[PDB]
Design a protein around this ligand. Structure first.
Ligand SMILES: CCC[C@H](CC1(C(=O)N[C@H](Cc2ncc(-c3ccccc3)o2)C(=O)O)CCCC1)C(=O)O
Ligand SMILES: CCC[C@H](CC1(C(=O)N[C@H](Cc2ncc(-c3ccccc3)o2)C(=O)O)CCCC1)C(=O)O
Ligand SMILES: [Zn+2]
Ligand SMILES: [Zn+2]
Lengths: 696, 696
């Protein structure tokens, strides 16, 4: 009664090699499921974390290199461009030759970088306007500094676009870093030293005198400024309610309610917006509707900005863009980033050039690269099997609604509506392979030079920014995929009410039409469940079947959601992370993902139980003294095999909305009665606490 | 009739994942056995080649890191030293702080480096003597320049040591490179540029004026000199007959037959030898017996050396030592080596610091590190099984003697004598684990400082050199192992008539007491056979049962050996290597190894056939439509799964005595009738030529 197929022995060996049978499954399931893997592996010097996901990503880069490196005769223009972008990226001889020259040429366009410019006030200060300086960086280069103004889908009308105003991203991973003490000390030191290093490289190349003391005085004034901007920013915990975050205002009321005095002006919100929108020849009036996500940040900003000059602000503004370009310049410029990335990521080295380039072209030409990927790596008969698993999981989500005591019939009926309306995307959009003009027209405006990598990167910035800005009066395209196919991940869009399973994640250990169903349901099944549950998490639950931010919950069911969820907030907030220095997880920031993990695995398990009821038991795996219910949980846990570098662990606890892999395993299985049943766990064993959290 | 053990499914998955079933085994067995592996893998940026051997080596480094990084309470002094050497090596902050300072301190001890010294003639030239300058580098630092004088086992008396005189190693991989054209152009340019770079770093640190033109003039004069020394050196093809290479002379006849005039002196062979031997307080007379391996080189050297000054010679002499120290200094010094190693190895990066350090301490404290390795990684019940496989393979070597038509009864009886006398070493010497004083006394003279890595490396150079020089009047220790245990390799010593199987190679795919015997015989069995056959190759056949260079062959059997071998010289010389630019293998240089591969696999196969005769057929592997005879050849071929970087392929074709992995597979299986029988290969199919080479 044992399976002896090639595909069953491959999976049994992987399961066997990764696990640690000497560990009690009911004491620590991460150690039991992953112990063998952790012992054999060390995180690469170029990696911040390593494990199942990162290994599959590394392997996907191999396939990209194969398809991108060799020109072919019948290659369509779109494919030629991807390959020519790749070739321009991999020629380090050509890049090195140019030094920082392409950046030197760029600086006058952005009002310069005051620290690396002589007489900045006479040269740039004279014309300088906050609304012109911020807009230039925004519209031409996609770099959002001081005020983050973007064109995006209306949360309250999923067919239209709106101008949004939000707090900007910071140079350090999170606002937390700005304390600049203990765990953050090395990151802050390496950040300012990186500002100093680049400023010195530019001065040397521009044949300017270098005063080390004035470099440190000016660069510490940028940190001083960004520390204030960071403290003004709202916490993620104060941004997790989409209904409270959504504030629709006219540009008139923004000018009235959020005044700013920059360089003793004041700030004209209308001039700023038109300075951005004219790039795309769109006229904006004071009767323009704007979604303001950060009203408190805009209020706090007012007394911050009056304190600094045009020179102080532009020193931060240009640094924020320059810090992103340095890695596209010569070795000397690339090297200036060494201590900063080690402090943030723990990595002592950059990834192979061919890997960075394969990723760069995949990120910028997702449909051209996705097409090449699928031909090479993806079997279309998998698409059909995955469609069927999704239909089974959506069904289990609806069936489960009835068993949920914490919701009323009225809210349950609307959750059924949302689930039935979920739009699934499996593998790749057919059009990328079958429609050559469509694929060619999407890149028509791009023209790459093989000796001009920096110009190629700059062209991509302007193009992606023009693409997004032009969407303002345009409607949201229902046929658009939220991800390319050459991606090892899955997604959910609230605004589109859509679940996506790129071809990249549709491979072992997640899925194979030849591996056992216990393994498929525990892998891809759990992942399908996770994406569906995102539609019903603390954020997703706020959007209807059409992707509109509208309340569809009764006061009671909504209060019950919050009550049921709070249990997971405490459970996960109580997990201490040794790699992050004993620090506790953010139970509030990781909530959405934790709901998705717990719901998703339960839904997958019930679908697997229904599969058995209908089809009977599966043939047991060779070399494993585990039944199929146990293999279900073994495979789910192996999806999360991995470890983190201490510096990256310190980063992710603050920036990532997901719990670390080990706690996604421990947390989920602690709440699963089906797990403790399958592993015959004793009451109050570490993996079997009496109190079990449950929302979905 | 199929095996379903955990250990059989692990091996079947590895075999399955590495092979390519879409390839005809009789068209290309490398592609069929390794195709799956080649497709999935790319050579790492830090690797010159990658494959089975390198993967196992990388994995062994993981184990070394585990055992070396954590101090333990009951650690013996020998273990504390290994761990403290490791810790000194991994602290790059401490190393970087020192710059090139530890090298600056070293230079006056070696008569300086003229290019990075002001007024070298007044400072060093005044006292300078070729015999003092060459001796200093030799005795204190183990650096052999111009004349390679060493203490080693007497080829004609395996119990004693003798002073040997040979041609030195060159800064570039082989003499071939010195053409400096085409394939060698980038290596020669990067070599001289590396001399220039280090000279400039030293001048900058010593606050000296830098004249770029005089750096290039002096450094090109070192290349000019080394090009002459390289052309004077004898080819490996002219060094493959141990009987012709062995020339016993007295120091008197060396002074009479090989005069040298350095700095218009002439050279005193007695002063040179005593300058070396006094380091160890050994007096040498002109009646001292010396083995001269390079008499023609010494003759050609005479008109070369008269042409150059003390300044020109010392510029090469110190560079040859400095080029080896640069990687033990700060980042700036480490970086000066970037283009040179890329030209020789194709690597764009150095391996992880912890990996270089684990290797460094394993290479210098092989018994301390081996002890830690075996406790952590090696099961002693494997030792017994391997002993038994060796006894079976030695037996098959003797049995086969009878079937050999090309040898006479008299030579066959002496080959039986040599084989019966072979001394086997399996896993590790018991003493490393059970005898603490012995282990502690071997490192007694070493005292490491954790903040002083360079001093630690310098101490190891002097210690290893004193150890070797002191052996002159001492007898050869019969109990000495030719390798440490933490090594993924196997060896044969002609002088000791000994075969070694370190614990590091006694693991899958080579060996496991739980994997199928077809896999064990095809893996470790082949490797045991290879090591035994080395005792009877074109070099080994010249040494008797006691390790003495004595003729035991009849004129006919010896001529027949040469006749039988010539077939392999042609077969392998006819293989064109695409990675080495279509270049052909050296059929003469790879002969010894090719004999060992072909003999070794045949001996292993016959032992496997005898195993079946006695024990019956083995249970078939799941997921494989291959019988056990086929699995034998599949596993042998998987031992050689791998690929090379083009630059390293250009290096190895010239420097390595082994054929590349793919040709070791194709060449061996082409000559194997048993292979074509097992795979039902058609006559004159690529894998089945009519003419089959055979010696052993
Ligand atoms: C935009 C969000 C997409 C996300 C997709 C999923 C996800 O969580 N994907 C990756 C998983 C990942 N990368 C590295 C590691 C890792 C490293 C070491 C140890 C353990 C793990 O795990 C992630 O972003 O966490 C949900 C389920 C699987 C796919 C979502 O829906 O939240
Ligand atoms: C001092 C000589 C020791 C040697 C030991 C053996 C050997 O040949 N060992 C290694 C094998 C090796 N390293 C990397 C690769 C490789 C990389 C890519 C593709 C293919 C292969 O293969 C070697 O030095 O070639 C004989 C049989 C096995 C062990 C001997 O007896 O000659
Ligand atoms: Zn998620
Ligand atoms: Zn060999």
């Amino acid at each position: 009664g044992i399976c002896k197929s090639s595909d069953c022995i491959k999976s049994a060996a992987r399961l066997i090699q990764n696990m640690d049978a000497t560990t009690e499954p009911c004491t620590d399931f991460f150690k039991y499921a992953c112990g063998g893997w952790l012992k054999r592996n060390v995180i690469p010097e170029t990696s911040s974390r390593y494990g199942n996901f990162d290994i599959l990503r590394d392997e996907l880069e191999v396939v990209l290199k194969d398809v991108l490196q060799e020109p072919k005769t019948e290659d369509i223009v779109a494919v030629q461009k991807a390959k020519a972008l790749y070739r321009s990226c991999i020629n380090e001889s050509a890049i090195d030759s140019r030094g920082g020259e392409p950046l030197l040429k760029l600086l006058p366009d952005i009002y310069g970088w005051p620290v690396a410019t002589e007489n900045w006030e006479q040269k740039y200060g004279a014309s300088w306007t906050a609304e012109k300086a911020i807009a230039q960086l925004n519209s031409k280069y996609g770099k959002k500094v001081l005020i983050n103004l973007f064109v995006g889908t209306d949360d309250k009308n999923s067919v239209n676009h709106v101008i949004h105003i939000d707090q900007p991203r910071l140079g350090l991973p999170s606002r937390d870093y700005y304390e600049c003490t203990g765990i953050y000390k090395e990151a802050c030191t390496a950040y300012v030293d990186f500002m100093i290093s680049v400023a010195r490289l530019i001065r040397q190349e521009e044949r300017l005198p270098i005063d080390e003391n004035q470099l440190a005085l000016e660069m510490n004034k940028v940190m001083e400024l960004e520390k204030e901007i960071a403290n003004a920013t709202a916490k993620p915990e104060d941004r997790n309610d989409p209904m409270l975050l959504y504030n629709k205002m006219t540009l008139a009321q923004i000018q009235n309610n959020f005044s700013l005095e920059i360089n003793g002006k004041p700030f004209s919100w209308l001039n700023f917006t038109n300075e951005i929108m004219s790039t795309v020849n769109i006229s904006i009036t004071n009767e323009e509707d704007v979604v303001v996500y950060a009203p408190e940040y805009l209020t706090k900003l007012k007394p911050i900005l009056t304190k600094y000059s045009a020179r102080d602000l532009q020193n931060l503004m240009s640094w924020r863009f320059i810090m992103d370009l340095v890695s596209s310049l010569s070795r000397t410029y690339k090297e200036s980033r060494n201590a900063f990335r080690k402090a943030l990521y723990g990595t002592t080295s950059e990834t192979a050039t061919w890997r960075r380039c394969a990723n760069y072209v995949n990120g910028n030409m997702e449909n051209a690269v996705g097409r090449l990927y699928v031909e090479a790596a993806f079997a279309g008969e998998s698409k059909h099997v995955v469609e069927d698993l999704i239909a089974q999981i959506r069904e289990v989500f609806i069936q489960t609604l009835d068993d949920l005591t914490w919701m009323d019939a009225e809210t349950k009926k609307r959750a059924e509506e949302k689930a039935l309306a979920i739009k699934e995307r499996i593998g790749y959009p057919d059009d990328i392979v079958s429609n050559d003009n469509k694929l060619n027209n999407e890149y028509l405006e791009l023209n790459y030079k093989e000796d001009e990598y920096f110009e190629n990167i700059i062209q991509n910035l302007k193009f992606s920014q023009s693409k997004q800005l032009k969407k303002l009066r345009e409607k949201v395209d229902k046929d658009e995929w939220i991800s390319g196919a050459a991606v090892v991940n899955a997604f959910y869009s609230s605004g589109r009410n859509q679940i996506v399973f790129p071809a990249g994640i549709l491979q072992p250990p997640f899925f194979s039409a030849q591996q056992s169903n216990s393994l498929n349901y525990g892998g891809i099944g759990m992942v399908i469940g996770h994406e569906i549950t995102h539609g019903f998490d603390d954020n997703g639950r706020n959007f209807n079947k059409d992707g509109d931010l509208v309340d569809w919950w009764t006061q009671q069911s909504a209060s019950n959601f919050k009550e049921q969820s709070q249990c997971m907030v405490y459970q996960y907030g109580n997990f201490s992370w040794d790699l992050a220095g004993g620090q506790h997880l953010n139970g509030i920031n990781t909530l959405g993902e934790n709901i998705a993990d717990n719901g998703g695995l339960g839904q997958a398990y019930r679908a697997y139980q229904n599969y058995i009821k209908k089809n009977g038991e599966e043939k047991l795996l060779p070399g494993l003294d585990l039944n199929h219910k146990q293999l279900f949980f073994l495979n789910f846990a192996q999806v999360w095999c991995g470890t983190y570098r201490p510096e990256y662990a310190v980063n992710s606890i603050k920036t990532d909305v997901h719990s670390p892999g080990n706690f996604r395993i421990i947390g989920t299985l602690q709440n699963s009665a089906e797990f403790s049943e399958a592993f015959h766990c004793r009451k109050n064993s570490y993996m079997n606490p009496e109190k079990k959290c449950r929302v979905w």
